[PDB]
Structures are given as structure tokens and as C-alpha cells.
Amino acid sequence: RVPKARNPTVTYGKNQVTMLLYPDHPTLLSYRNMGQEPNYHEEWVTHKKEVTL
């Protein structure tokens, strides 16, 4: 049995998404583009952080 993370807070803008993360222990975050070029990215998060995509 493995645990699950809590929900983030999300705000919207023109052609971008902003997210605020609340981790309790190290967690992995990744995202990809749909279509022909995925452009894979990956990072580890250990504390409160804000990202924009």
C-alpha cells in the first residue's frame, strides 16, 4: 500500500497555467506535449514551490 498527495491550487491566464504545490515528502512532477513532439520534462520537489507552464 502506497500514499496519495493532496490537491494543488490552480489559476488561469492567457496560454498559461499557474500552480502552487504543497508537498509533505519528496514527490515527482512531469508533463508532456500532445502531438508529434512530446518535449518531456521531469523534476523532483521537496518544498513549497510555484511553477508556470
Binding site: R1, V2, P3, H25
Partner: protein, 53 residues
């Protein structure tokens, strides 16, 4: 490190010490320290307490 020992029949103790490196692997995309109440299930393997041939 790893150490084992026991007590003799004349109230004397014995020990022996060997070097070792212990680090359990990670299952899933999160690192956790104990067993939660709310979560998901994934496959893994164990030892069975049986004395059969």
C-alpha cells in the same frame, strides 16, 4: 553495520560484527516512511513463513 549476539549458560555475552550496506528500494513515484490509511495498492514480493520442504 550488522551485529548479532546471545547469552551463555554462565552469564557471559558474545557478539560478532560485520560490515554491510542496507537501503530498501522505492515503490511508486513517492518516498514515504510508514503505512497510511488512505491510498492505493501496487505489486511487490515477500518471504513466506513456511517450514515445508
Amino acid at each position: 553495520t550488522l551485529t548479532v549476539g546471545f547469552t551463555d549458560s554462565r552469564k557471559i555475552s558474545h557478539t560478532c560484527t560485520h560490515p554491510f550496506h542496507h537501503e530498501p528500494p522505492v515503490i511508486g513515484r513517492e518516498r514515504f516512511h510508514s503505512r497510511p490509511q488512505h491510498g492505493k495498492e501496487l505489486p511487490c514480493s515477500t518471504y513466506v513463513q513456511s517450514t515445508a520442504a
